[PDB]
Amino acid sequence: DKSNKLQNLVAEQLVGCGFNEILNNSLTRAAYYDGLESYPSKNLVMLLNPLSADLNCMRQTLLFGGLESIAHNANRADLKFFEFGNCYHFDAPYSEDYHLGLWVTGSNSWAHADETSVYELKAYVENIFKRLGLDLHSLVVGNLSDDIYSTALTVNTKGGKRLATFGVVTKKMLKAFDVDNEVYYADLNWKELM
Amino acid sequence: DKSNKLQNLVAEQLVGCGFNEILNNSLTRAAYYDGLESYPSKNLVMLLNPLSADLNCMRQTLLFGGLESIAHNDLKFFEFGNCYHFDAPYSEDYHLGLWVTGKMVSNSWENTSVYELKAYVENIFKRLGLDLHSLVVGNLSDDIYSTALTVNTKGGKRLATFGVVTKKMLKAFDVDNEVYYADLNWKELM
Amino acid sequence: KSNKLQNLVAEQLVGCGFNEILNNSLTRAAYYDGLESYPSKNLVMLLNPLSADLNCMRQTLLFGGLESIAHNANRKNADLKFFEFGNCYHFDLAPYSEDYHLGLWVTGKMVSNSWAENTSVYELKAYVENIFKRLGLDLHSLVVGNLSDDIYSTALTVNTKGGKRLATFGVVTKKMLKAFDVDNEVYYADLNWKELM
Amino acid sequence: SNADKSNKLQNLVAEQLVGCGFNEILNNSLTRAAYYDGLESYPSKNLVMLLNPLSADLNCMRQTLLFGGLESIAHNDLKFFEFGNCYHFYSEDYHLGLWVTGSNSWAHTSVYELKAYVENIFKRLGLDLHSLVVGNLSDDIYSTALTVNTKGGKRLATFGVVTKKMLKAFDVDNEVYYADLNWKELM
Ligand SMILES: [Mg+2]
Structure with a gap:
């Protein structure tokens, strides 16, 4: 209830700041994590017969879904997106966490260097x-x-x-994700902020 | 977009009727589906190395999580969540x-x-x-x-x-009261 | 004040699942044929009409909304709920008048x-x-x-x-x-906004 | 029976209220439709109306105990209570x-x-x-x-x-604090 009310409040606040709330699938591509240090492949919650499926694991981070949404957006320099969602982690060896x-x-100019x-x-x-x-x-x-x-x-x-x-x-x-304009990303560990 | 507002409006309405919101893990136990017809074992999205842990698949239905919650704690619960289906054979749907x-x-x-x-x-x-x-x-x-x-x-x-x-x-779930269960295919309702 | 209340009513309707719509005030005189509630003789006619479908200023909001319902057909299982604020026009020194609905x-x-x-x-x-x-x-x-x-x-x-x-x-x-190609029942309200102020 | 139980709890509450200085009152189930004219909380549309209501002073069943108590207050620091049936469109609910x-002086x-x-x-x-x-x-x-x-x-x-x-409306001065408990629902 604390989570739920505070999720509602944080969302209203962000919408009031011109954010759009997005929703991405929890099913994802293992290949996105090939070679990564921060979200290593070995900690992926992999699915059965992963060679035969494009979506073959559960997301370890929200990040990649967000990049897909930006890349896919018809209007893609004024985008503010936020997403509340579960991520999955393998070390109970498996865990689900909420993020x-x-x-x-x-521009060019001296006057407007501050944006x-x-x-x-x-x-x-x-x-x-x-x-x-x-x-x-x-x-x-x-x-x-x-x-x-x-x-x-x-x-x-x-x-x-x-x-x-x-x-x-x-x-x-x-x-890698076909996104051209700069992207600033924040990952907030929601459970730990309660 | 419309989904988010409505989820909220529906959550509020349900709380007003004395419902409490629950959140259950999307990871679950394949054994729950043993010999089921409505949610066949063969349609479970299993995890790689399913023997390596108690949790060994993704849920096909929200039902069992709720029964676990009832068996844990006159209850009124609701839950928004993804379920997972193996037929890109792996899909997710919102319930x-x-x-x-x-x-x-x-x-x-x-x-x-x-x-x-x-x-x-x-x-x-x-x-x-x-x-x-x-x-x-x-x-x-x-x-x-x-x-x-x-x-x-x-x-x-x-x-x-x-x-x-x-x-x-x-x-099967050590539940001693009758339970009345609804499953709404939320995406289909948008 | 009218503006404040219009906003308040809009917010309330949107809260109840309505969407606001906006229809042209230029409309089709033939919609009014043989009507008694909004007679053809009280239409504000254009001097230089664009076509038979665009030859007068609307006397009622109704018809534009029926056009909108027609164009918003869906395969979903949802009621359409629409609202519109707009002027209508009437012919009766100054025979042409307007009011807000x-x-x-x-x-x-x-x-x-x-x-x-x-x-x-x-x-x-x-x-x-x-x-x-x-x-x-x-x-x-x-x-x-x-x-x-x-x-x-x-x-x-x-x-x-x-x-x-x-x-x-x-x-x-x-x-x-x-007559409007609408295949669901329609419940319609017309509130005379100025009179409510 | 349930009525035996309601009767016992009703008596316990009545004794407790009396002990605290309340007086029990009893008012007619028959009442005046006029009372409910225009009300939102107890709509006139929900009255159990009696036949030929224009030809009878008391022409409907009460939906609420409120009005009988205000009549009782007028007719006498009062503390009153009443158990009684109310009626509306069909329900009889015991209430x-x-x-x-x-004072205004700081000490009190x-x-x-x-x-x-x-x-x-x-x-x-x-x-x-x-x-x-x-x-x-x-x-x-x-x-x-x-x-x-x-x-x-x-x-x-x-x-x-x-x-x-x-x-x-009922010729009652000063302040009245009123409570309506849905007795039936508390059983
Ligand atoms: Mg006492």
């Missing part, structure tokens, strides 16, 4: 954090450069639980 | 399930509870702006329901199924 | 000759009642009359004690659904 | 009504005392307080009120402050 993903897509950056995403994230009554001074923030992120921040409790990751998707990953 | 507990199972002296359950479903349909007159209602008793109604389009597409869960099924 | 259209069952309109007027009555409440209108001040004409098989009128029409709503005639 | 009438009236009496009735009846859903209400009867429902949504009680208008 909130955010996707924000993004599209990761910081607009960080603001969205902070505002979610404040709406959940998170103590901002408790947070331990670290740095990440990834197979998914060229740069990004990790956000942990003083106790060590991962609360969030957010940053700038590598251009390579964007090329 | 709304309702569980309503009734009287203790006894040998003492089902019609009237199906019609209480039907009232909740009607009110869901109205909230979805559905044309009640366009529906075709059928009778059903199977391995899931001793007594149930099916709701089809005039073309014969299934939109909902609801009724009384078999005593055998109740027994 | 809110129309509501709600579709029902497929037209059939099967056994079993009373319950339809009662369902539409609720949306109208809640609009009135939203406008702070005092229900017990209103006088409700019965009506049957070329538009409605069965209808209610809502009037002030003085006899001023505030709303009309009911079941659209079968003949009219047919 | 319990409670009426309580009501409201609905809170009425709530306490209601809560004490719920407890006498073994009703689990923690399963109850409370809502707000404002209408032609109450300027402010709480509604009390079961989890599933069945109305068990309504209690609050009667509108000054309603009280004006």
Whole structure:
């Protein structure tokens, strides 16, 4: 109920900020994870006879679905998408966790150099954090450069639980998914924010 | 888009009728489907190395999760969730399930509870702006329901199924009260 | 104020599963042929009509909504619920006048000759009642009359004690659904918005 | 029998209320349709009307105990209660009504005392307080009120402050706090 009410509130808040809520399938492609360090293939919840099926595993991250939606969007530089959803993980060796993903897509002039950056995403994230009554001074923030992120921040409790990751998707990953304009991605560990 | 708002409107309406929302794992046990006809074992989306763990497949039906929840805890539960089907042989579909507990199972002296359950479903349909007159209602008793109604389009597409869960099924789940179960094919209703 | 209330009523209707529609004010004079409720002689005719289908300004919202229902046919199992705010025009120094209306259209069952309109007027009555409440209108001040004409098989009128029409709503005639290629029943309300202010 | 049980609990509650200073009142089941003219909460359309209603002062069955209690208040800090059948289109439902009438100096009236009496009735009846859903209400009867429902949504009680208008109609001054408990539903 706490989750459900707070999900509703976070959604209303994000829609009020011009976000669109998306829904992607939990069924996904194992190949997306081939070679990955942050979401390794060995931790995929694989399905039976996976050679004979295109969708052959359960998603370990929301990220790839979001990239598919962006790539497929008729209007694809002003996109703000969010998705609440279960992800799946193999080490009970199997686990199901609930995530909130955010996707924000993004001139010449001196006057208008102050506009599209990761910081607009960080603001969205902070505002979610404040709406959940998170103590901002408790947070331990670290740095990440990834197979998914060229740069990004990790956000942990003083106790060590991962609360969030957010940053700038590598251009390579964007090329892989047929997306041209910059993408800022946040993965919020929803259970840990209660 | 329209789905999200309606889910919310339906969740609120159900809470107002004293329902509590539940969330069950999409990972489940193939053994639940053993010898079922309505949700055949052969249509289960099994996991790779199914012997490696207790959880060994994706759910085909929301039903069993709800029975587990009833057997865990007069209950009224609802759940929005994906189910998974093996026929790209692997698909996912979105369902709304309702569980309503009734009287203790006894040998003492089902019609009237199906019609209480039907009232909740009607009110869901109205909230979805559905044309009640366009529906075709059928009778059903199977391995899931001793007594149930099916709701089809005039073309014969299934939109909902609801009724009384078999005593055998109740027994399989250590459930001691009668259970009234609805499964709404939510995507089909959009 | 009118603007504030229009927004409030729109939000309420959208909340109830309505979609707002917008239809052209330029329309077809032949729709009004032989009508008594909106007579052909009271139409505001164009000096330079574009065609037989575009030769006058609308006298009623009704017809545009029936066109919209016709164009919104679906294979889904859902009622269409539409509303529209718009001006209508009347010919009677200044013979041409305009007034502002809110129309509501709600579709029902497929037209059939099967056994079993009373319950339809009662369902539409609720949306109208809640609009009135939203406008702070005092229900017990209103006088409700019965009506049957070329538009409605069965209808209610809502009037002030003085006899001023505030709303009309009911079941659209079968003949009219047919003439518009609409194959579901239609419950239609016309609220005279300015009079509600 | 069920009626034997209702009778016993009715007596326990009546003794408890009397002990607390209430007087039991009894009013006619026959009433005036005029009372219900224009009401939303108890619609005129739902009265069990008697034949030739224009030719009888008392021309219908009561839907609510409220009006008889207001008549009783006029005719006498009062505390009144009444058990009695109500009628509407078909239902006969037994109800319990409670009426309580009501400084400004810092050292030293409201609905809170009425709530306490209601809560004490719920407890006498073994009703689990923690399963109850409370809502707000404002209408032609109450300027402010709480509604009390079961989890599933069945109305068990309504209690609050009667509108000054309603009280004006029955020649009643000051404040009246009124509770209507759906006795049948509490059995
Ligand atoms: Mg006392």
